[PDB]
């Protein structure tokens, strides 16, 4: 939330974005796909020289279908593909103990805890 | 009863997709700016490190919900300059290249109808707001791509490559899937086009006359603000101490006596922070469930035609178009509805030469003197021939069979 | 791990070991010290329980979604788009994983495509002809009818179409011939 001004360890390659002042990352003008998020449409990744690249996300290639009013496209061949999906079903079952955790093996601590109501049942 | 006329309708649906991302900072919130307060806080082991690790976990999901809902195209499609869609008119929702923030007209109305220093008040206490990853321009581009896909590729583009096809034949295919044969459409092209255009025109007027449906999208924002305000106001309570000013206590009492007041204040503020974070965690689940539902609707109603009833509008579904709204999405469902019904007398089967004839399609009807067979969802009489029925047994077991004569067209031809 | 490590905090007491307190003080002045430790540990336990309760609902929702996917994509064929993998769906296979399930969706995807010119209907003898199933295509010199998702040209016949009304009412009709297969066999 600083604007580039006030710095404490600055070198060069200072860049300003909408998410703050970025120091140490080189800025380019060729878009790519997002690898490590930064924000406000700015993404950074470690591509080639050996520096950190910061750029704007690219949504993908652009094409315009050759639309008409008497033109159609029909396939002539097909393909079979196989895809995988992963879904969780459960996690680890656990259980704790009232006295063993809060009071340990003490005997006075249990009597003192009985002052409280049913806070562990 | 058989319908004889049909009406095209347009319905709207509003769904929230995400909420604002906030973050806290205990040491500048609970303790403000002091040294003794931090030393006292050090006794409580790892509370705030956990709280800050949970709030970022909440925040990271808001940048994934929008990606799961909108980013469902691997390309970016562009509408052609040709605008001959058989009579239809998508000028109200197609992007308009006349303003720097390229958006459609209805999107502009949606943005203007939702109204959002508070940030400085948070900066007093270390609270901060983080911007979303996807800017609104990107969302507008995604919506334009999705809308341009269905115009010029039907529903094939969502399951492989994009294949162009004239709009009229696509609409004919879509009617073919709801039980009406194609020949209806081409005999009512202008009548359907005018109805669709008028239906589209009604929506902007409805949204320009202070619509009360957008409040659902508004309400959530209000709630967040309310809760946040409460948090700041919590700082103005003494919690049973002498005063709520941190420096005042240190400036009027000995440290060994001021430590107990400091402890009381710390306990109170920590409890308030816990309650606020728990509220945020509770609300995040509801927002995420709504986002998943919106993603399902987007994948089914838009990229195809869904035969599920009352899942993509009220009636027989034809298609849908998406629109982006501040922190939410708006669906426009196009629907087909029968209009004017007429009475008829029916009969299950016909037997003519000792064998019962069942209709291969549609239903038998009769106006009182002659018998016809017609498709179920529209009145269109045809003469009963052997290309419309099939034989099964002899007429002794059907409950309500009736005499009549079957044409059998081959015999006149051979004559 | 965080919950178990919380046990070391002093919580504003003399020491975090309870035996140290009850080996150095007489109980009337020891109860007040023990109270703070009890309060802090109880609060930590409450926080952990609340977090687990919150996460359980999300996991149960995911489990219900997995159950629906198993019931629909596997025990049958589902026509819902993008509910059993990208493209058209054919079948599914389940696999087990530690605390989870893995789905293998088999999908059919059209590969290539070609350009063609098409017309909505055909006028032959003043009557419009419509395709019973498929679409009309023409490579610039002849006219065929083919199925939607594959290329398989066939000759237009009265056994492959149906008539309705008269032409000049359709927006883009074109004129051609129809075979009528019965006629040659009649002679
Ligand atoms: C971020 O810092 C730059 C650097 O100063 C600001 O640019 C200044 O803006 C003020 C008011 O707009 C001008 O009076 C100065 O002359 C500008 N200086 C320079 C070097 O440009 C910029 O405005 C700051 N960001 C914001 C949002 O205010
Ligand atoms: C349809 O596609 C398949 C696969 O893309 C083609 O099969 C290949 O044909 C080439 C001949 O040029 C062979 O060398 C390959 O080995 C075949 N692939 C496999 C997996 O066996 C098929 O030829 C295509 N059909 C048409 C009509 O083009
Ligand atoms: C089906 O309904 C449409 C309108 O919903 C009818 O079209 C109207 O016809 C009247 C003639 O009496 C005209 O005055 C209107 O202007 C028409 N409406 C529109 C929007 O153009 C149509 O006639 C009905 N069909 C039948 C068979 O009754
Ligand atoms: C499609 O709809 C647009 C929107 O109404 C039509 O554009 C209007 O045209 C009239 C005159 O024809 C003007 O008075 C309006 O100001 C126009 N509105 C807008 C928003 O531009 C358009 O004529 C319709 N038809 C076509 C083929 O585009
Ligand atoms: C029921 O429909 C039949 C079929 O159109 C009607 O019969 C026609 O009636 C008109 C007017 O009387 C005649 O010009 C036609 O020659 C008749 N055709 C046949 C095949 O009979 C009949 O009139 C209708 N009945 C009622 C009560 O409306
Ligand atoms: C179909 O028509 C016949 C009439 O030819 C109806 O019933 C027959 O009637 C004749 C004399 O009228 C009897 O000799 C036959 O025995 C009758 N048939 C039977 C099966 O009993 C017959 O009911 C008509 N079908 C209907 C009205 O559904
Ligand atoms: C369009 O396809 C048809 C179908 O094959 C072609 O017509 C055949 O062409 C071959 C030689 O090119 C002839 O031997 C056949 O007799 C033709 N069949 C008929 C029914 O006429 C036609 O040539 C193709 N046209 C183009 C421009 O490729
Ligand atoms: C398709 O061909 C038929 C002829 O079989 C055309 O019908 C005649 O077209 C001419 C000129 O287009 C008219 O002058 C006649 O009145 C039409 N009817 C006849 C001769 O009975 C038909 O117009 C053609 N359709 C087209 C070119 O779209
Ligand atoms: C990136 O910005 C620099 C600075 O003006 C400009 O010279 C350069 O042309 C830009 N990159 C491209 C690819 O245009
Ligand atoms: C059909 O007949 C019933 C009884 O005569 C009548 O109540 C009903 O209105 C008729 N249907 C229509 C569409 O008029
Ligand atoms: C239909 O009902 C009428 C009386 O309501 C009865 O006379 C007739 O037999 C019934 N027909 C059938 C097929 O149920
Ligand atoms: C079909 O024709 C159009 C006409 O310009 C062309 O742009 C398009 O690339 C063609 N399709 C293929 C697959 O070659
Ligand atoms: C298709 O568009 C062309 C313009 O390129 C026009 O000449 C033709 O009449 C149109 N056909 C239909 C059926 O609209």
Residue numbers in the entry:
A (entry chain A): 614 to 617, 633 to 676, 689 to 761
B (entry chain C): 713 to 828, 848 to 1146
C (entry chain A): 960 to 1146
Reproduce, without paraphrasing, sentences from the article in which this PDB structure was first reported.
The recognition of the betacoronavirus SARS-CoV-2 host receptor, the cellular membrane protein angiotensin-converting enzyme 2 (ACE2), maps to the S1 C-terminal domain (referred to as the receptor binding domain, RBD), while the function of the N-terminal domain (NTD) remains enigmatic. Here we show that the NTD of SARS-CoV-2 spike binds biliverdin with high affinity.
To establish the structural basis for SARS-CoV-2 neutralization by a biliverdin-sensitive antibody, we imaged single particles of the viral spike in complex with P008_056 antigen binding fragment (Fab). Access to the epitope is gated by a solvent-exposed loop composed of predominantly hydrophilic residues (“gate,” SARS-CoV-2 spike residues 174 to 188). To allow P008_056 binding, the loop swings out of the way, with a backbone displacement in the middle of the loop of ~15 Å. Thus, when bound, the metabolite appears to act as a wedge that restricts gate opening. Antibody binding is additionally complemented by an upward movement of a β-hairpin (“lip,” SARS-CoV-2 residues 143 to 155), which overlays a cluster of aromatic residues. Accompanied by profound conformational changes in the NTD, antibody binding requires relocation of the gating loop, which folds into the cleft vacated by the metabolite. Access to the tetrapyrrole-sensitive epitope is gated by a flexible loop on the distal face of the NTD. Our results indicate that SARS-CoV-2 spike NTD harbors a dominant epitope, access to which can be controlled by an allosteric mechanism that is regulated through recruitment of a metabolite.
